[PDB]
């Protein structure tokens, strides 16, 4: 519902079920951003990069990958996270620091880069807006159902989507 939001979703073989598992949520318009994150000693590289992206309180989107958390995947894992984050920004004609990355799923498992590579090469701006439903499904792992919520305030709309029901007691800052 809110203006200038578009949603990209697709299967990338994070699990082998052909389920949408790769989301890009972006804004056709510059967005001020507010965000908090885990403070884990095994913070994944997706997190480090986000903390960096939001440092200027200025960000236009997030690419989220579900069914692989990309954590404790050493230098390579850090390299794929740079790679996925940069290539999403780039496919969308956006500056790097204006795009964040978030990844959920198993620990200690390398991305299916071969597969993500090929999808990226097709990635482009979804026409029309909204689709937060697709995004709420596409991020979901041990969740039995999607989680969406929408509110009107003073002529503007605010939507939210969430996920997680295990490995869950956030302590974010």
């Amino acid at each position: 519902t809110p203006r200038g939001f578009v949603v990209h979703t697709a299967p990338v073989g994070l699990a082998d079920d052909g389920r949408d598992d790769f989301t890009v949520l972006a804004s056709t318009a510059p967005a001020t951003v507010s965000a908090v994150f885990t403070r884990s000693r095994f913070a994944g590289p997706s997190v480090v990069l986000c903390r960096e992206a939001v440092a200027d309180g200025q960000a236009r989107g997030v690419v989220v990958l579900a069914r692989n958390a990309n954590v404790a995947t050493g230098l390579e894992g850090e390299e794929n996270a740079r790679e996925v984050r940069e290539a999403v920004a780039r496919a969308l004609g956006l500056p790097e620091g204006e795009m964040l990355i978030a990844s959920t799923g198993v620990i200690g498992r390398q991305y299916p880069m071969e597969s993500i590579r090929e999808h990226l090469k097709t990635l482009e701006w979804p026409a029309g807006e909204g689709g937060f439903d697709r995004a709420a499904r596409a991020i979901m792992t041990t969740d039995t159902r999607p989680k969406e919520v929408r509110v009107s305030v003073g002529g503007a709309t605010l939507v939210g989507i969430a996920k997680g029901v295990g490995m869950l007691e956030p302590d974010m800052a």
Binding site: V36, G105, K147, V153, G160, M167, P170
Partner: protein, 213 residues
């Protein structure tokens, strides 16, 4: 892993927004616990473009609170394996931060969590739970109250077991709903805080045993 992202066309002051986002985040997503296992990857973001013009930061903070909170209960109802949502409401703490510390200890107690699952009014476990906060030496068991739904099981007024027998039965009734409420007063100062979680089912064990997640 918790992931949640919020998107609005509201124009807001960037400063007031971060500040606003933090206060809602601490009351909601920072107030929920399924297994205590704070992931490696949590991420909560809000995107705000000005596309619809200037909203009252106040109206917005309310709106967001209402939103994150719906998603939070939604998280706890869906807790891996869960049959029941546990809402632990703490008041009378020395400060808010103790309230939540006491809240969290309660909802994170396996013994509490299983008692709520089995519908066994084993409130004494909620006593053990509070007791666990052994560094808070101003928690006085003489002054502390406990309730499940609208029934106070502690402290014992009078003598014997008949007060506890009836009303433990009343607790067993309230437990049968899909949402259990634990109320706890400390009688110290005005610290208040509600935390959320869920019963610990056997589904929880099967899921996290038989699958790799």
């Amino acid at each position: 892993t918790l992931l949640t992202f919020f998107a609005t066309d509201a124009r807001l002051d960037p400063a007031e927004q971060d500040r606003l986002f933090r206060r809602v985040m601490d009351r909601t997503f920072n107030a929920v616990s399924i297994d205590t296992d704070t992931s490696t990857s949590d991420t909560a973001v809000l995107f705000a473009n000005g596309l619809a013009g200037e909203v009252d930061a106040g109206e917005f903070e309310e709106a967001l609170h209402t939103a994150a909170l719906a998603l939070v209960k939604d998280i706890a109802s869906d807790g891996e394996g869960a049959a029941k949502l546990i809402e632990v409401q703490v008041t009378g703490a020395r400060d808010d931060a103790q309230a939540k510390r006491v809240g969290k200890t309660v909802v994170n107690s396996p013994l509490v969590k299983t008692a709520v699952h089995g519908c066994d009014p084993n409130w004494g476990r909620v006593a053990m739970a509070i007791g666990k906060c052994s560094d808070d030496t101003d928690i006085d068991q003489e002054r502390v109250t406990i309730r499940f739904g609208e029934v106070e099981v502690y402290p014992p007024k009078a003598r014997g077991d008949q007060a506890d027998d009836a009303l433990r039965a009343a607790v067993a009734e309230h437990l049968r709903g899909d949402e259990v409420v634990i109320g706890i007063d400390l009688a110290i100062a005005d610290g208040a805080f509600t935390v959320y979680g869920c019963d610990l089912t056997e589904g929880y064990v099967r899921l996290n045993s038989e699958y790799t997640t």
